[PDB]
Structure 1
Amino acid sequence: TVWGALGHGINLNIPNFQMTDDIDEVRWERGSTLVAEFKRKPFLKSGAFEILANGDLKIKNLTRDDSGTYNVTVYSTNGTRILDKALDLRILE
């Protein structure tokens, strides 16, 4: 339990913790609501995928299921939706 005076700021300290390079995620939440979220590593649905340094999507092993349309959505530091493109992945034969 932590006390803090109104109007002024407070830092909720994380108990027995030491921020190391091993740490990938730290998620602060008040109830079900996500308050603050930190994550070092990019999100990948499965191991089949891999996001590149230039934003490109790399599907490691193609499969009939891997077809369908994909959507790229890029946002700037400001947060504006800079880009919004669609790609139709089709399997050759």
Structure 2
Amino acid sequence: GTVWGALGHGINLNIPNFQMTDDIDEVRWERGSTLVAEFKRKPFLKSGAFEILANGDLKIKNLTRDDSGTYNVTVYSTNGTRILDKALDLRILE
């Protein structure tokens, strides 16, 4: 579809034939290679072997030798400021 805007004015690009519900995890808007806006309710998780807790802690379900190594955590405040950055060396008893 084609949408018309005009200089100096604002505009809302409406998602064609769609209704927002709770069964929606993400809405992504891109313009070519540019990511313009993105909404994502559930956290990103590499796999089910992991889960991020309420407090922000990382839970690893079943440890294997592959899980050892250095993990980096970064925390950003509501305004985007990087308030924390720590490296956590996870070693595994075998």
User: What TM-score, normalized to structure 2?
Assistant: 0.96
User: Which whole-Å CA distance do the structure 2 matches of 1:7 and 1:91 have between them?
Assistant: 60
Runs of 4+ in structure 1 off by over 6 angstroms are none
User: Which whole-Å CA distance do the structure 2 matches of 1:7 and 1:61 have between them?
Assistant: 56
User: Which whole-Å CA distance do the structure 1 matches of 2:62 and 2:47 have between them?
Assistant: 12
Aligned residues: 93
User: What TM-score, normalized to structure 1?
Assistant: 0.97
By how many angstroms is 1:78 displaced? 1.1
By how many angstroms is 1:46 displaced? 1.1
User: Which whole-Å CA distance do the structure 2 matches of 1:25 and 1:55 have between them?
Assistant: 21
Root-mean-square deviation (Å): 0.7
* CA displacement, residues 26-74 of structure 1 (integer Å, 9 cap, x when unaligned): 0001012110001010000111110000000000110100000000000
Please state whether the residue corresponding to 1:65 is helix, strand or coil: helix
**Stretches of structure 2 lacking an aligned partner (at least 5 in a row):** none
